[PDB]
């Protein structure tokens, strides 16, 4: 029964400013750890103590704190760094925080996106599948829609969201809308539209059920 | 160099029992404390053992205390974890670590790459895969639905690697204890149709590979 909550859950940084990400206690504590994980790879070793900086770890990381409300401090940031770090304490119970996503921050894209009707595979099996790609956009946060025969649906949409690319440095969703066969062959004109901080209006791409 | 490397789990049905172990390289084991550490899904991390250097002591945590036990062999430079009448809030991955003392507390140095264990009672089943083709441009953008599988991890080679650098992977979601997923891939119009593209899934857990040609509509 100790919680650290690790203050900012996901942070946009560019290269070359400063970075402060938080972990602040439930309760006063003699010293705060910080580990590293970046996808695919389990936590590495990045500050012990409070400001003890493990061999590899670059200079420009710092640490700081006393009591309730310790911190890790980034001198300039660079692409190199972006990755989860959490905090743990040693006091009473082991505890780690939530981690800090690190992104990094590059110039807005709007998604290139890409609409494909349930295969002639899936039908005959009872099902149809509708599905969405919006492709290589910055930022993350989007909104999308899909519009059956103009009116629209929540129900049943699947939507997945890559990790941030490590060349263009943009993110990909994909969206699922899973009728069945015969839910699929009540409409006609299929539509997902995604609302986003570039574009204006959305992007929308559509076709007809009863064209094939 | 230090190494940390674990074996064991995978799918086991509430109430089973299981054991874990992780193997220890190019440092004195006797000398240090290990401990288990687990990660959920959602990237949740949770200290669940510890022993000494010797046998002496172990600690728990209290979400296991009870039906884990963690013991060390000092002749192999191996860890065990014994995991008795295991819950469905067990599911994660389970790294080795180990704990190195500092001025006044200890700190995880070097953590194994974890192996995985999925508490649940379903069926291991083979993943449906269907093409993705559009019903107008200089590059086109297919697909391939990877839907209702169970055990998670699969995998979708496209052209048997030749297409890496412009494929996305999205996460598998769950839903109806089915996991669905799907990938993308890019490729420049004079490649396609002119050329085969197939995405090839493999499911290791089934022993299940299949493949599909996407043909244009």
């Known amino acids: 029964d100790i919680v650290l909550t690790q203050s900012p859950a996901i942070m946009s940084a560019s290269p070359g400013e400063k970075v402060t990400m938080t972990c602040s206690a439930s309760?006063?504590?003699?010293?705060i750890h910080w580990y590293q994980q970046k996808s695919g790879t389990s936590p590495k070793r990045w500050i012990y103590?409070?400001?003890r900086l493990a061999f590899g770890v670059p200079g420009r990381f710092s640490g700081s704190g006393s009591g309730t409300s310790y911190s890790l401090t980034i001198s300039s940031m660079e692409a190199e760094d972006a990755a989860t770090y959490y905090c743990?304490?040693?006091?009473?119970?082991?505890?780690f925080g939530g981690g800090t996503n690190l992104e990094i921050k590059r110039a807005d894209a709007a998604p290139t996106v890409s609409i494909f009707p349930p295969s002639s595979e899936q039908l005959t099996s009872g099902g149809a599948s509708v599905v969405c790609f919006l492709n290589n956009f910055y930022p993350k946060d989007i909104n999308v829609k899909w519009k059956i025969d103009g009116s629209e649906r929540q129900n049943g949409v699947l939507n997945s969201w890559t990790d941030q690319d490590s060349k263009d440095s943009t993110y990909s969703m994909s969206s699922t809308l899973t009728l069945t066969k015969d839910e699929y062959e009540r409409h006609n004109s299929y539509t997902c539209e995604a609302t986003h901080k570039t574009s204006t209006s959305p992007i929308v791409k559509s076709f007809n059920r009863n064209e094939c | 160099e230090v190494k940390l490397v674990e074996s064991g789990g995978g799918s086991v049905k509430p109430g089973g029992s299981l054991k874990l172990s992780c193997a220890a390289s190019?440092?004195?084991?006797?000398?240090?404390?290990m401990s288990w550490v687990r990660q959920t899904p959602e990237k949740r991390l949770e200290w669940v053992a510890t022993?000494?250097?010797?046998?002496?002591?172990?600690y728990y945590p209290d979400s296991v205390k009870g039906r884990f036990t963690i013991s060390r062999d000092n002749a192999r430079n191996i860890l065990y974890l014994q995991m008795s009448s295991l819950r469905s809030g067990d599911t994660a991955m389970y790294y080795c670590?180990?704990?190195?003392?500092?001025?006044?507390?200890?700190?995880?140095?070097?953590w194994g790459q974890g192996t995985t264990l999925t508490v649940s009672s379903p069926k291991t089943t083979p993943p449906s895969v269907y093409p993705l083709a559009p019903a107008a441009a200089s590059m086109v953008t297919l697909g391939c639905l990877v839907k209702g599988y169970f055990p998670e991890p699969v995998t979708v080679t496209w052209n048997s690697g030749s297409l890496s650098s412009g494929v996305h992977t999205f996460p598998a979601v769950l839903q109806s204890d089915l996991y669905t997923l799907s990938s993308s891939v890019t490729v420049p119009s004079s490649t396609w149709p002119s050329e085969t593209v197939t995405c090839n899934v493999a499911h290791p857990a089934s022993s299940t590979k299949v493949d599909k040609k996407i043909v244009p509509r």
């Open positions: 670590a180990r704990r190195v003392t500092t001025v006044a507390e200890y700190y995880f140095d070097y």
């Open positions: 190019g440092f004195s084991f006797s000398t240090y404390g």
């Open positions: 022993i000494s250097g010797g046998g002496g002591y172990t």
């Open positions: 309760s006063s504590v003699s010293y």
């Open positions: 103590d409070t400001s």
């Open positions: 743990q304490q040693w006091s009473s119970n082991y505890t």
